[PDB]
Coordinates of C-alpha atoms and ligand atoms in Angstrom, one line a residue:
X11 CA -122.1 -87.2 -3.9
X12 CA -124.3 -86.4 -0.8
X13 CA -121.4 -85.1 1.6
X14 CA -121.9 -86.6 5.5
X15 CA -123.0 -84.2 8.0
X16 CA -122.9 -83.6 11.5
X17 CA -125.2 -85.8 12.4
X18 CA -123.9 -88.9 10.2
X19 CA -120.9 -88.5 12.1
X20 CA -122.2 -88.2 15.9
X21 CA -124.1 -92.0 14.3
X22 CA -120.9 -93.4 12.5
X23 CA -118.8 -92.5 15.7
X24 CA -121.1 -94.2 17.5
X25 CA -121.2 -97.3 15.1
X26 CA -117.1 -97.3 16.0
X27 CA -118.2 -97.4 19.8
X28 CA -120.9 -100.3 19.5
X29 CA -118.1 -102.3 17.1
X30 CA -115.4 -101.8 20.0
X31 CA -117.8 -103.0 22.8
X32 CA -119.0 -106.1 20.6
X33 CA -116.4 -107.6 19.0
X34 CA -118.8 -110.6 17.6
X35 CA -120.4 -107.4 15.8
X36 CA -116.8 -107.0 13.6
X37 CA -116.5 -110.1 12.6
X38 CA -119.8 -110.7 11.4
X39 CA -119.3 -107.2 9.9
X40 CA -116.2 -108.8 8.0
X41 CA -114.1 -106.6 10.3
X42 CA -110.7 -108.1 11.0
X43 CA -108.9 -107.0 14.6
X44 CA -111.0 -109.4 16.8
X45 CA -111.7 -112.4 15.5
X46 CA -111.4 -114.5 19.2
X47 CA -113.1 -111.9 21.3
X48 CA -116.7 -111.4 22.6
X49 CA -118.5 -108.4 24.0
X50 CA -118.7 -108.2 27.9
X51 CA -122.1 -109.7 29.4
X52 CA -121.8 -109.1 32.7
X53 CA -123.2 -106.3 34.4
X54 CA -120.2 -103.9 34.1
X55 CA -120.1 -104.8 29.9
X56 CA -124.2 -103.7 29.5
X57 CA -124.4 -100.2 31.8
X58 CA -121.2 -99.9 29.4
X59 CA -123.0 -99.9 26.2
X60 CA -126.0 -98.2 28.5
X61 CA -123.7 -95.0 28.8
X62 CA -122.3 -95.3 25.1
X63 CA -126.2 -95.1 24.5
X64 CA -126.8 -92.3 26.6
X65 CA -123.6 -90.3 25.7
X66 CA -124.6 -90.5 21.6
X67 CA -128.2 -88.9 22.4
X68 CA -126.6 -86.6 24.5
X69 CA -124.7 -85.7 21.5
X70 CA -127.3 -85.6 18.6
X71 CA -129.9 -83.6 21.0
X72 CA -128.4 -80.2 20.3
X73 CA -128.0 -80.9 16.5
X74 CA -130.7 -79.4 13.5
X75 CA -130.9 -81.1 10.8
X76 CA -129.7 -80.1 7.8
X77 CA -131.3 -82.0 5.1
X78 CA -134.4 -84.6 4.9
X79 CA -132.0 -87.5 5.5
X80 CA -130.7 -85.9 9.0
X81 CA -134.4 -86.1 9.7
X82 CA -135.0 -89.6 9.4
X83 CA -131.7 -90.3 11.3
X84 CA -132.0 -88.0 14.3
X85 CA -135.8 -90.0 14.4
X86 CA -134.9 -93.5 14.0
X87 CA -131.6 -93.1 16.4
X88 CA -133.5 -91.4 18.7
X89 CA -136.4 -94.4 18.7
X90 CA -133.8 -97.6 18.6
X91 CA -131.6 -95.8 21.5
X92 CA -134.1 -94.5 23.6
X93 CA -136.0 -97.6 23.9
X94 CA -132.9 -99.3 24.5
X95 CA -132.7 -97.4 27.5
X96 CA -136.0 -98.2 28.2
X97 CA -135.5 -101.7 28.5
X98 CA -132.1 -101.8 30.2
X99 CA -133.6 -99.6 32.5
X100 CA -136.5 -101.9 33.3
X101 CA -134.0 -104.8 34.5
X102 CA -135.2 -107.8 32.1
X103 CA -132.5 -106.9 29.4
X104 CA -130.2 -108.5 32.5
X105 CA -132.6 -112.0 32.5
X106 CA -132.4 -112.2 28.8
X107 CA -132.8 -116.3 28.1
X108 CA -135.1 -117.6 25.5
X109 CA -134.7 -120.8 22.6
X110 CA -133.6 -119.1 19.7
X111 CA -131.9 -115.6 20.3
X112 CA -130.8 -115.3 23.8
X113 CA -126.9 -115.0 24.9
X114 CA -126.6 -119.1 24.8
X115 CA -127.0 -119.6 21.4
X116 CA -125.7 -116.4 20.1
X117 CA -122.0 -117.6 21.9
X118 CA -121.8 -120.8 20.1
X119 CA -123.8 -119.5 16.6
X120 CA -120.7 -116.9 15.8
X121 CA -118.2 -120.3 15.3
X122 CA -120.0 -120.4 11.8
X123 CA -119.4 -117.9 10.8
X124 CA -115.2 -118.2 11.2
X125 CA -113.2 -119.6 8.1
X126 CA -111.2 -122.6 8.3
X127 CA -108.6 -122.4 5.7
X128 CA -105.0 -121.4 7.3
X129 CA -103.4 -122.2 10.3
X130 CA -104.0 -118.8 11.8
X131 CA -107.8 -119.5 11.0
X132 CA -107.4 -122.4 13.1
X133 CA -105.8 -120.3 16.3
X134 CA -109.0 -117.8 15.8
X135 CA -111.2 -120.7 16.3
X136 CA -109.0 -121.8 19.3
X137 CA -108.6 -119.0 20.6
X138 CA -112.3 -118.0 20.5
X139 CA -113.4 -121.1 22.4
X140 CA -110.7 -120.1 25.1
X141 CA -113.0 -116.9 25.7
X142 CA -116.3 -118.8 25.3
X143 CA -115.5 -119.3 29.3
X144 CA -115.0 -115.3 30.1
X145 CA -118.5 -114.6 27.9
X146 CA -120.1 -117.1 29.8
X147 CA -119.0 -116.3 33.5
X148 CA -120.1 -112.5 32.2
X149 CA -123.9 -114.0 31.3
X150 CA -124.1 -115.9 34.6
X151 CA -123.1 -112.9 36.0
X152 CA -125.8 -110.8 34.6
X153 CA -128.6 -114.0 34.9
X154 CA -127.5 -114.2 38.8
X155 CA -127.8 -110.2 39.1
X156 CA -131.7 -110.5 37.7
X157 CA -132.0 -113.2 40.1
X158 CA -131.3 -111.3 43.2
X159 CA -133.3 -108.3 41.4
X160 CA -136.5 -111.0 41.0
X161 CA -136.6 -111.2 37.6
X162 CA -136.1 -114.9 36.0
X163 CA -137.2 -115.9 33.3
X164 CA -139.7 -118.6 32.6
X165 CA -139.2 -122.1 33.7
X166 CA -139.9 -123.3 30.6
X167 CA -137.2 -121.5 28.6
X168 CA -134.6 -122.3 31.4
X169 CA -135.1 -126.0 31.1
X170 CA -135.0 -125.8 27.1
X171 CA -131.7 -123.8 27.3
X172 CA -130.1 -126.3 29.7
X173 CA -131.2 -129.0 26.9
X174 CA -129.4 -126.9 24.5
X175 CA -126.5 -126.3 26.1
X176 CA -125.9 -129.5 27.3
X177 CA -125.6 -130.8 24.0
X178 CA -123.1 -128.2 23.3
X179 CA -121.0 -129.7 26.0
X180 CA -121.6 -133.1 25.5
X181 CA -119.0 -135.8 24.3
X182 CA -120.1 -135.9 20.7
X183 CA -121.5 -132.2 20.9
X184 CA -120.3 -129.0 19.0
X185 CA -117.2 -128.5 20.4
X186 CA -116.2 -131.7 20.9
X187 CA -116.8 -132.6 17.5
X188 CA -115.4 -129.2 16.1
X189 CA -111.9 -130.6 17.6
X190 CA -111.9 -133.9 17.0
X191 CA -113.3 -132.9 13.2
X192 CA -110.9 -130.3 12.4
X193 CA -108.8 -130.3 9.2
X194 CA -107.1 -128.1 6.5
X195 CA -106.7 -128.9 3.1
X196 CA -108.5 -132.2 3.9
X197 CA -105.6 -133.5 6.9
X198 CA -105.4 -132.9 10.1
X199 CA -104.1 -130.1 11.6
X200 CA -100.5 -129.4 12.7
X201 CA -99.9 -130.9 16.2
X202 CA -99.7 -127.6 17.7
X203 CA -102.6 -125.6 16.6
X204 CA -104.5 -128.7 17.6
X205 CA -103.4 -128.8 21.3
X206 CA -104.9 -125.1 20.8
X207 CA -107.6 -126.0 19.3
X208 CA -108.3 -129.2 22.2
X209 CA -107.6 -126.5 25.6
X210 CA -110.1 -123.9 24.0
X211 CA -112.9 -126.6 22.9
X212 CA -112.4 -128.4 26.5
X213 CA -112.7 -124.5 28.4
X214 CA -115.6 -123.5 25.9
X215 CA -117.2 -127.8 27.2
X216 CA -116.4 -127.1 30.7
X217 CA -118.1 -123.5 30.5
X218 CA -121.6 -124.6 28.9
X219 CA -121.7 -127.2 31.6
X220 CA -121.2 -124.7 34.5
X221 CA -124.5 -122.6 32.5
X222 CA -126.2 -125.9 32.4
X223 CA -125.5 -126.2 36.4
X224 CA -126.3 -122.2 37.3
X225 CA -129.8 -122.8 35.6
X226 CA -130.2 -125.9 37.2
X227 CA -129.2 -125.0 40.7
X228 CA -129.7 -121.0 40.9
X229 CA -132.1 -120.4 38.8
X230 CA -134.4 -123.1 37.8
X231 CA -135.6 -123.2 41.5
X232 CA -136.8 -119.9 41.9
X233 CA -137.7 -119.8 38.3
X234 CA -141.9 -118.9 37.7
X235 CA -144.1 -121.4 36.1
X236 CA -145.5 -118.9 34.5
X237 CA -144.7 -118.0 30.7
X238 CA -147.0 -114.9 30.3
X239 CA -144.8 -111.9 30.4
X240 CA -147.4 -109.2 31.1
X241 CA -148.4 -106.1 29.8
X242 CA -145.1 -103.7 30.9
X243 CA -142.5 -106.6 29.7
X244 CA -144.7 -106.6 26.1
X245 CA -145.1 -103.5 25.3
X246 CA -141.3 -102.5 25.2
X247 CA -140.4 -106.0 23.6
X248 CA -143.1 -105.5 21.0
X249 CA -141.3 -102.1 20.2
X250 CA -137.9 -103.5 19.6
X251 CA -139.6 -105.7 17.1
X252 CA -141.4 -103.1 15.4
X253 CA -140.5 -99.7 15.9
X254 CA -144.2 -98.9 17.0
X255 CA -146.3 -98.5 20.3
X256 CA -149.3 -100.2 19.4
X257 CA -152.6 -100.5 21.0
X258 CA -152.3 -104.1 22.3
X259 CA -155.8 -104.6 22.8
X260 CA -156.9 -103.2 19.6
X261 CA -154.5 -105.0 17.8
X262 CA -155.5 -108.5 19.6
X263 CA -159.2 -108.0 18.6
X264 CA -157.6 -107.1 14.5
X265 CA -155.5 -109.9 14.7
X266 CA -158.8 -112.4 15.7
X267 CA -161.0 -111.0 12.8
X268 CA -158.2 -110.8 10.3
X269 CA -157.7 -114.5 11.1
X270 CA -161.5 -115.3 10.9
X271 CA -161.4 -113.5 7.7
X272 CA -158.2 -115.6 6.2
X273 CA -160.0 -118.7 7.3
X274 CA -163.0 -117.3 4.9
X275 CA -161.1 -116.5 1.7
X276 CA -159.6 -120.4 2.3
X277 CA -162.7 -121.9 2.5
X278 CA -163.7 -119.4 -0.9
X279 CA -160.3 -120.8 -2.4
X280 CA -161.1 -124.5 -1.6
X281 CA -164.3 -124.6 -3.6
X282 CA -162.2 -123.2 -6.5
X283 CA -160.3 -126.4 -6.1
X284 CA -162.8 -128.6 -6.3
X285 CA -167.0 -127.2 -5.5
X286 CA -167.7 -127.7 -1.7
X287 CA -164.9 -129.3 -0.4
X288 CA -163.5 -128.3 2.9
X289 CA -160.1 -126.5 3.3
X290 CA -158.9 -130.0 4.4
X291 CA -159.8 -131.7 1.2
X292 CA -158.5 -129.2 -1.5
X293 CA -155.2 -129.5 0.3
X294 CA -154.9 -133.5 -0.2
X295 CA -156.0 -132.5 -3.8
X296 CA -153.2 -130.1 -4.6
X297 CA -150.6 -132.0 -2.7
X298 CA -151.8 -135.4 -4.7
X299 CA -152.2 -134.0 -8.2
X300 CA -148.9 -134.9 -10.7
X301 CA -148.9 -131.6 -12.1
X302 CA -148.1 -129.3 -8.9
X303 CA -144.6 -131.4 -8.0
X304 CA -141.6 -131.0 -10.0
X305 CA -138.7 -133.7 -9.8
X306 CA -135.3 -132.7 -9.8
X307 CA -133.9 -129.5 -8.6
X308 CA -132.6 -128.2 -11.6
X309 CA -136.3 -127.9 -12.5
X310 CA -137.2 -126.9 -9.2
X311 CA -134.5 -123.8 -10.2
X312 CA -136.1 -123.5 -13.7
X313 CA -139.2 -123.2 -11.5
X314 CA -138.4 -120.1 -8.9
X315 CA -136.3 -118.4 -11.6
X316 CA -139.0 -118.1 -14.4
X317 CA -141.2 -116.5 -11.0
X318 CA -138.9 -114.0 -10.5
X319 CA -137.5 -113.3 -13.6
X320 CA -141.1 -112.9 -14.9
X321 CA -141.8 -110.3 -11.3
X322 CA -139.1 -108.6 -12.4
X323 CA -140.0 -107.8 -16.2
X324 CA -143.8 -107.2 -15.1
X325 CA -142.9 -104.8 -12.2
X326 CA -140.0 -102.9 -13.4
X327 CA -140.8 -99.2 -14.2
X328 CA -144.6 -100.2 -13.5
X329 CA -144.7 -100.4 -9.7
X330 CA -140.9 -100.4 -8.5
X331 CA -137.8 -98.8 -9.9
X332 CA -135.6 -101.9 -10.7
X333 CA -132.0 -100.6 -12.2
X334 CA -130.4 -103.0 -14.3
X335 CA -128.0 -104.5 -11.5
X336 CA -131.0 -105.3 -9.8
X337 CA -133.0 -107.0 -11.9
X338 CA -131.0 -110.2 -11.1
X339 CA -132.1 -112.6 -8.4
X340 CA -130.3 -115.6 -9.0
X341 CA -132.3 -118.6 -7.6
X342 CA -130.5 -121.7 -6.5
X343 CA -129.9 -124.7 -3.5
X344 CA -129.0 -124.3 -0.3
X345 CA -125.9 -126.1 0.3
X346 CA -127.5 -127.0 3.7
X347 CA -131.2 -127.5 4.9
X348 CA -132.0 -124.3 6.7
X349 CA -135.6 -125.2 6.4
X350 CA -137.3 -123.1 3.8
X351 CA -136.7 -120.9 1.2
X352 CA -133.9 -117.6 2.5
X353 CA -132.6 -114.2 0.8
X354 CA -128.7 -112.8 0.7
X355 CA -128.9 -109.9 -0.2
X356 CA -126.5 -108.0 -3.5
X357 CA -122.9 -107.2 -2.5
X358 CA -122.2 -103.3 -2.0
X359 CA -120.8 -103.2 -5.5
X360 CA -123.6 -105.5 -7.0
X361 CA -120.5 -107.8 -8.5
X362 CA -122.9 -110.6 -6.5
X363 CA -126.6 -110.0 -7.1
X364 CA -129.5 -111.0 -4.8
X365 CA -129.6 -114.8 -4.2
X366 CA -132.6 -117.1 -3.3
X367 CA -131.9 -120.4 -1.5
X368 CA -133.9 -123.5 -1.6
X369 CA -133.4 -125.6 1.5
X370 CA -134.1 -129.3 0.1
X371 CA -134.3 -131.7 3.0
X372 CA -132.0 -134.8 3.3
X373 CA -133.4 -137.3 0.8
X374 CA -136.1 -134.9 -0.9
X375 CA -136.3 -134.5 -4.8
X376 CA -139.3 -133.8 -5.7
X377 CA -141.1 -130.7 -4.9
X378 CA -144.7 -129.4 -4.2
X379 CA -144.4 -125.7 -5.7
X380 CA -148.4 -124.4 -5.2
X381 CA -147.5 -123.6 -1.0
X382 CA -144.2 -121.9 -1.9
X383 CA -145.2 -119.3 -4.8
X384 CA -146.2 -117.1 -2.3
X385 CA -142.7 -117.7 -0.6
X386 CA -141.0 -116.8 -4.0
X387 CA -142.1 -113.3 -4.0
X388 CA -141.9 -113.3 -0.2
X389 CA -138.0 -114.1 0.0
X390 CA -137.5 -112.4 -3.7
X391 CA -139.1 -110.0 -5.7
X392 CA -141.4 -107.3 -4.7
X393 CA -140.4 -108.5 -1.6
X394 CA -136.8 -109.2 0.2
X395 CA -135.0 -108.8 -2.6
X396 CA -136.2 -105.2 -3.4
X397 CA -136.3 -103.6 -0.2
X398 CA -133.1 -105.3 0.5
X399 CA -131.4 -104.4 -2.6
X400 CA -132.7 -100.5 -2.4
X401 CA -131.2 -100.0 0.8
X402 CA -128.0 -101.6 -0.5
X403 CA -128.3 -99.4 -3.9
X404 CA -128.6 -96.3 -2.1
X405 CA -125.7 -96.8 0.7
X406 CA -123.7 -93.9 -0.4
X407 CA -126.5 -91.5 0.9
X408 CA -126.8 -93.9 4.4
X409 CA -124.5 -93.5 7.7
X410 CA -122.6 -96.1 9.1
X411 CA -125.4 -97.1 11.5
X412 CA -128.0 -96.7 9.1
X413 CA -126.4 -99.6 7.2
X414 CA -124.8 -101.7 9.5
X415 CA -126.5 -101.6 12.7
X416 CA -130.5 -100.4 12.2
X417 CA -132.6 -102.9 11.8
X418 CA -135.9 -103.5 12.7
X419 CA -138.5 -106.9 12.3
X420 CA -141.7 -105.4 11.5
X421 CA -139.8 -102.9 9.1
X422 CA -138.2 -105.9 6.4
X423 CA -140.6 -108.6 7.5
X424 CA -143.6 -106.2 7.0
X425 CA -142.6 -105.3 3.8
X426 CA -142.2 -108.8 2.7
X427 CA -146.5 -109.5 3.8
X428 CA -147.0 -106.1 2.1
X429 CA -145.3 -107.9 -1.5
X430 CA -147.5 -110.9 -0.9
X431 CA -150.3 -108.8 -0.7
X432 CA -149.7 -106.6 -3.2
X433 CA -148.9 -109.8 -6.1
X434 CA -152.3 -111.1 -4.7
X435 CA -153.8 -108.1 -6.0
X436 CA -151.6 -107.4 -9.1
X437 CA -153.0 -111.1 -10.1
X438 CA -150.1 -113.3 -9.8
X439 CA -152.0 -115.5 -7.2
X440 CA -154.7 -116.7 -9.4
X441 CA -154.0 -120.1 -9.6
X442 CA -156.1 -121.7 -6.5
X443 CA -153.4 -123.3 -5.5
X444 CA -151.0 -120.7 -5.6
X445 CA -153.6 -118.6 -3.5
X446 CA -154.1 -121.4 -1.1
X447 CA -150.2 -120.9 -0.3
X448 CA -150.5 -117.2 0.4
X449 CA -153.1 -117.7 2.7
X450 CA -151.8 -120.1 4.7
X451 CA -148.4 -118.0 5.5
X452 CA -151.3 -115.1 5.9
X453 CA -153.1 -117.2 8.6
X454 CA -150.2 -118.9 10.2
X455 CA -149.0 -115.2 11.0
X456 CA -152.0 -114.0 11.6
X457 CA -152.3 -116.7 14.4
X458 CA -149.2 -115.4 15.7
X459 CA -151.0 -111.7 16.7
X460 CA -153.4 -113.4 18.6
X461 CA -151.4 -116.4 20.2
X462 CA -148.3 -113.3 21.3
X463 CA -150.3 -110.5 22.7
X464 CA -153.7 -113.3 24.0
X465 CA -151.1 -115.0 25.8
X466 CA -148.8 -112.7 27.4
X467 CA -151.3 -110.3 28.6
X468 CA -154.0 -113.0 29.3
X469 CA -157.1 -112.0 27.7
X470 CA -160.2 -113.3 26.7
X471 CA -160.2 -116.5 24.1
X472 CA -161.7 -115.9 20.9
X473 CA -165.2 -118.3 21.1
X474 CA -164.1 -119.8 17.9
X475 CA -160.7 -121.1 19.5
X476 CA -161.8 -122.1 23.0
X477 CA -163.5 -120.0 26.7
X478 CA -161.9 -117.9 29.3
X479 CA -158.8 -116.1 29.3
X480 CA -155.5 -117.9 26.9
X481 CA -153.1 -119.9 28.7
X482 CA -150.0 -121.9 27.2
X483 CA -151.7 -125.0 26.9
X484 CA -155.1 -123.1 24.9
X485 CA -152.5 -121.6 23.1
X486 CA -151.4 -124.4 22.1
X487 CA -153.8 -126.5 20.6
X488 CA -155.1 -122.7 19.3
X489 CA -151.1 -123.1 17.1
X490 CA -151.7 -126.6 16.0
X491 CA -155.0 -125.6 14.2
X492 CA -153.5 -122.8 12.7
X493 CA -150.1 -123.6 11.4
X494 CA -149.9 -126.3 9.1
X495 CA -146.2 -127.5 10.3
X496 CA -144.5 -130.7 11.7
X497 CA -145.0 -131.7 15.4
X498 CA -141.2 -130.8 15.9
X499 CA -141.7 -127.7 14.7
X500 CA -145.1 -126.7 16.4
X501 CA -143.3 -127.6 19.8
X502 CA -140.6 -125.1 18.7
X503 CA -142.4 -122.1 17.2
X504 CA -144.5 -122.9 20.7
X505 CA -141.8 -122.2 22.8
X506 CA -140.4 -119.5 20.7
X507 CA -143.5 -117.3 20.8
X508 CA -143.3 -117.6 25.3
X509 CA -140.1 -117.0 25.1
X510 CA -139.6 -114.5 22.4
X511 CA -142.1 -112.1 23.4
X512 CA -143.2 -109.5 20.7
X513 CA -141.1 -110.8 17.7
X514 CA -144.3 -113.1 16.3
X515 CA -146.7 -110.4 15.4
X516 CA -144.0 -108.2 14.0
X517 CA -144.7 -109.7 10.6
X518 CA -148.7 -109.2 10.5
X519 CA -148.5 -105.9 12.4
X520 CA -145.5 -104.7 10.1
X521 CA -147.6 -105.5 7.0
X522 CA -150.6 -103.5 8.9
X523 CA -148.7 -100.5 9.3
X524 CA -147.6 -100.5 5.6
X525 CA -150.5 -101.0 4.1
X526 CA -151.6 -97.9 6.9
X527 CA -149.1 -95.5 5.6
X528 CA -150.1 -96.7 1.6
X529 CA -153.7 -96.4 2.3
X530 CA -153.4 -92.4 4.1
X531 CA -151.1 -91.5 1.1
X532 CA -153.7 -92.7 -1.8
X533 CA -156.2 -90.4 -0.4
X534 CA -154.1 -87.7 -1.7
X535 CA -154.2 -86.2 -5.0
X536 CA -151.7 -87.0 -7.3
X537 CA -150.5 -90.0 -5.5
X538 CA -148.0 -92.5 -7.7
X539 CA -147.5 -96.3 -6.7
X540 CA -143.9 -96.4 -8.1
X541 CA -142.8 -93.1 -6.2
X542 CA -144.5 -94.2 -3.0
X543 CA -142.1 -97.5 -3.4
X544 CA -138.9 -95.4 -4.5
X545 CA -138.9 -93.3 -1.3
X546 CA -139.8 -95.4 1.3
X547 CA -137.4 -98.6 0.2
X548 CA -135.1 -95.9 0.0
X549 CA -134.9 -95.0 3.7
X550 CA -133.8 -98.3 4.3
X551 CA -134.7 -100.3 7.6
X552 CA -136.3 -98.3 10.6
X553 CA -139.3 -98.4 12.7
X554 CA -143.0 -98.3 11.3
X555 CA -143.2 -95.1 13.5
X556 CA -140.2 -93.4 11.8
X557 CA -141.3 -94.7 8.4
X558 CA -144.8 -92.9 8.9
X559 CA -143.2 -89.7 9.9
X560 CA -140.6 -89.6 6.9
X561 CA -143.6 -90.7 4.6
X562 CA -146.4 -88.5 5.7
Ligands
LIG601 MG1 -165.6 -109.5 15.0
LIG602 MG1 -137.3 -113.9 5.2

């Protein structure tokens, strides 16, 4: 019963603008209205949003808060919207191409989301494809306009997103297949809609290919070798991934010593494994010993949901506020392989509670548990799950953009580090190869500090991990020492971190700032673990600067 004030209005007015200049946002807001249309990439479509930006700070710089909550809001708008305007300011927002969250994929990714059940569902689809051409020419537009302004981004990433998208184009690629596949109710589709459904898969074919050819022709040539995106570029892309200005220097030379000190507890945990053995040999021992795989998922279920059913009993009204709807986190498999363990959050109502979602790989049944422990509480409870859930839990007391459109990287992906850490320390990790697990997400993300900020301002290597200043190809072998992954997978989180600048470290440098706003607050007298928890999950996701000043 906390009535919306002034300034939840100037925000959820604003929320109305952003859903009206992105489309895409509705319908992966559940939105009907616009199910076949895509926000405007060109030029025109971003000083658009620019002035929508500009035009809602304009309106909340005049308004006083009138309660705690207004606080928070006026702060975290006035962070996200200024530093958009930052960046679209700068010119780069314009050149925006990278392998995993650049315009490219983000065209062809919303088809997954669209249902497939009626005929009508079936004109969406068509009909979505038919504007996959407009959202493209508005890209290229945009791409072209940073190209005249000198600002291309790195060869690298432009050759991986012509691989991408030529795929999407090809005979037997996406949309090609999404046509040829198409049924409902398990026959194919009424003449009709299919003719649809063939013209907008063959304009959405033709319009990846033109992309492929702009990047080859235009922009590929003048394109720099180059991946390192400097100092100015990083800072303001480090921001958008963690609400903070930090000092990149400072936090380089924490991210090399917290990664020498991971590497220490390791070795420590290894010789709890079995006495002297390297880090190398305790692994082949815990990934070769009967009694750390389980066969079958249904005992792979048993498995997680005993982990957090047993969180949830030990933590509630101890060191988090779990009310009853809560309490659930219903653990089960994927019915695809994303790859890992992921979190969907509660439904507004709580009719659906918290899921947890083991991705089992084609062919896999049995199932190593001592490197996935960690993830458990990671993905589930005290982490996602919680902070996920509170948010949810308290929505009635949350604007529009609050709950729909705020979110920041270091904010939810912090938080998750901080509930590792913290069932580390509560004594849930005591099992050496439980512990082994937790370090070796700790040190693969620690890596990530030092590989993102070494790299894209160019200092000095670490002597442990090689001489001079980082490069991509130091950096490289630097990732393959420090991430126990696939090859495939290397090569991609590789590309990722040069193309994605500032994202990587979010997770590390989230769970720094955390523990940085815990550690000032138990200096105080009186302080309570449980109510620090309560009111900062409460405020829901926003910058570690904004979290600091609604905390302290
Ligand atoms: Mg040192
Ligand atoms: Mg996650």
């Amino acid at each position: 019963v906390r009535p919306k004030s002034a300034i939840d209005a100037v925000a959820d007015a604003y929320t109305e603008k952003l859903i009206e200049l992105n489309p895409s946002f509705a319908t992966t807001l559940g939105l009907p209205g616009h199910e076949t249309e895509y926000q405007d990439y060109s030029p025109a479509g971003a000083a658009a949003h620019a002035e929508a930006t500009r035009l809602a700070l304009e309106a909340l710089a005049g308004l006083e808060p009138s309660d705690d909550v207004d606080a928070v809001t006026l702060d975290a708008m006035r962070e996200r919207l200024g530093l958009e305007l930052e960046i679209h300011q700068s010119g780069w927002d314009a050149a925006d191409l990278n392998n995993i969250a650049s315009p490219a994929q983000d065209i062809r990714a919303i088809f997954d989301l669209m249902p497939t059940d009626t005929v009508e569902h079936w004109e969406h689809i068509a009909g979505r494809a038919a504007n996959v051409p407009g959202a493209i020419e508005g890209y290229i537009a945009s791409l072209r306009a940073a190209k005249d302004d000198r600002k291309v981004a790195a060869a690298r990433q432009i050759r991986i997103v012509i691989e991408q998208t030529g795929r999407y184009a090809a005979e037997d690629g996406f949309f090609a297949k999404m046509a040829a596949d198409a049924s409902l109710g398990d026959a194919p589709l009424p003449a009709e809609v299919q003719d649809k459904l063939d013209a907008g898969t063959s304009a959405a074919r033709s319009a990846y290919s033109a992309l492929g050819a702009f990047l080859r022709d235009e922009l590929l040539p003048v394109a720099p070798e180059k991946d390192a995106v400097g100092r100015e570029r990083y800072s303001l892309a480090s921001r958008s991934f963690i609400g903070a200005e930090v000092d990149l220097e400072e936090t380089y030379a924490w991210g090399v010593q917290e990664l020498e000190r991971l590497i220490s507890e390791q070795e420590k945990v290894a010789g709890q494994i079995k006495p002297g053995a390297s880090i190398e040999e305790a692994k082949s021992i815990l990934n070769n010993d009967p009694a750390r795989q389980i066969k079958g998922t249904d005992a792979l279920k048993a498995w997680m949901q005993e982990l957090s059913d047993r969180a949830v009993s030990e933590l509630a009204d101890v060191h988090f506020d779990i009310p009853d709807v809560m309490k659930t986190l219903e653990c089960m498999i994927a019915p695809t392989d994303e790859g890992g363990i992921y979190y969907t959050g509660p439904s507004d109502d709580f009719s659906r509670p918290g899921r947890m979602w083991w991705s089992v790989p084609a062919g896999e049944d049995t199932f190593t548990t001592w490197s996935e422990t960690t993830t458990v509480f990671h993905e589930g409870v005290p982490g996602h799950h919680l902070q996920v859930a509170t948010a949810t839990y308290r929505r009635e007391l949350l604007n529009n953009w609050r709950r729909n459109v705020c979110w920041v990287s270091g904010h939810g992906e912090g938080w998750a580090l901080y509930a590792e850490q913290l069932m580390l320390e509560l004594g849930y990790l005591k099992d050496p190869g439980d512990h082994m697990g937790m370090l070796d997400g700790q040190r693969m993300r620690a890596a990530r500090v030092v590989f993102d900020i070494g790299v894209h301002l160019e200092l000095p290597v670490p002597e442990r991990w090689g001489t001079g200043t980082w490069t991509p190809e130091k950096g490289f072998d630097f990732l393959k020492a420090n991430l126990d992954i696939s090859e495939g997978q290397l090569q991609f989180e590789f590309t990722r971190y040069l193309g994605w600048p500032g994202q990587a470290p979010s997770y590390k440098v989230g769970q720094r700032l955390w523990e940085q706003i815990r550690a000032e607050l138990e200096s105080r007298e009186g302080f309570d673990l449980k109510s620090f928890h309560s009111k900062a999950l409460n405020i829901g996701s926003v910058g570690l600067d904004v979290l600091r000043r609604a905390l302290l």
